[model samples]
Target: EGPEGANLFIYHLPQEFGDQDILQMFMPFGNVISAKVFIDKQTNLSKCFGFVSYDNPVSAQAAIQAMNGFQIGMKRLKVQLK
Candidate 1:
């Protein structure tokens, strides 16, 4: 794998969600370094945008090809490889 195999941007997260829920969602894909859910800088609330870093960039692409339109809660997740 190469460093060029980037990160996965996750969007359309449900309000107040994106912890273990999102973490487990990607397990079948491959080894993930982190599934971070960004929060408000001051309020510290979920912004519904975050990135999941895989062990390699190829894994990131595999995830998008396989799970890009997958749904979580009432939202259809938008997944992209960066």
Candidate 2:
């Protein structure tokens, strides 16, 4: 609503993947407003999940269709509306 964008939840990311990694990966789908990877507080390690925000709903849906279940190395990405 208003000028707010759509948000997506992405799971099963690689340990090495970071915020920038998700940004780059979803950029092709649309204008990414923000990208973030969840981190463990105690160990300072990746939680293998993150969030991506798009400037529009279309972009968000596009990313879901294309990135959902997408294979990255041995893990399959799980993308969905957040």
Candidate 3:
């Protein structure tokens, strides 16, 4: 996918999701080429926005279905296909 298509979607993630938790959450969907949780450089906390890259569209789509609306730490996650 191009840059525009590469962006997946997420929702209801806690403001403090650690890097490991974010990575672990998306790892099951595919070979995560990379996972990034935007953080404040000063305070070093999650910015509540992140992205995950899967090797294939199938894996990406699977993650959206399986994880959307799933809860984590009292937050219900949402996912969208890129």
Candidate 4:
């Protein structure tokens, strides 16, 4: 067995923004493989949570260290390994 891709994880973000915006912000840190913002099924609005996948583990780790508690818009971001 190997480590697998658990290296990629979610970075909880404020729902005040959209996926594209969030992706753009994190792109400078590393190659963002994908970004998804959870949305309410009933309301179809954001759920105040999101996931970001980095191409490399080192980039992901760096993003976490550099971006955790980082502020964007009016909310502070929270980054962690999924």
Instruction: TM-score winner between 1 and 3, please give it.
Output: 1
Task: Write down the lDDT of every candidate, Cα atoms only.
Answer: 0.78, 0.89, 0.74, 0.70
Q: What does candidate 3's lDDT look like per residue over 1-82, in tens digits?
A: 2233445767667898875777798888777776777788999978776777777777778788888888888978877765
Q: List the residue pairs that clash in candidate 4.
A: none
Write model 4 residue lDDT over 7-81, tens digit each, in one string. 334444666667897678778777887877778999988877777777777777787788788876677777877
Which RMSD values do the candidates have, in order? 2.4, 2.1, 2.4, 3.4
lDDT tens string, model 1, 4-64?
Answer: 6657888888767766776777767878777888889898889997778788777788888
Clashing pairs in 3: none
Query: On residues 1-82, what C-alpha lDDT tens digit does candidate 2 reach at each position?
Result: 1124489999999989999999999999988878999999999999999999888988998999999999997999999897
Q: How many backbone clashes does candidate 4 have?
A: 0
Comparing 1 with 3 on lDDT, the higher-scoring candidate is 1
Between prediction 3 and prediction 4, the one with superior lDDT is 3
Error (Å) of candidate 3 at residue 64 is 0.2
| Model 1 residue 40 distance off true place after TM-score fit, in angstroms | 0.6
Q: Hey, what RMSD does candidate 4 come out at?
A: 3.4
**Number of the top lDDT candidate:** 2
Model 3's TM-score against the true structure: 0.80
Give the number of the best model, judged by TM-score: 2
Per-candidate TM-scores read 0.81, 0.92, 0.80, 0.79
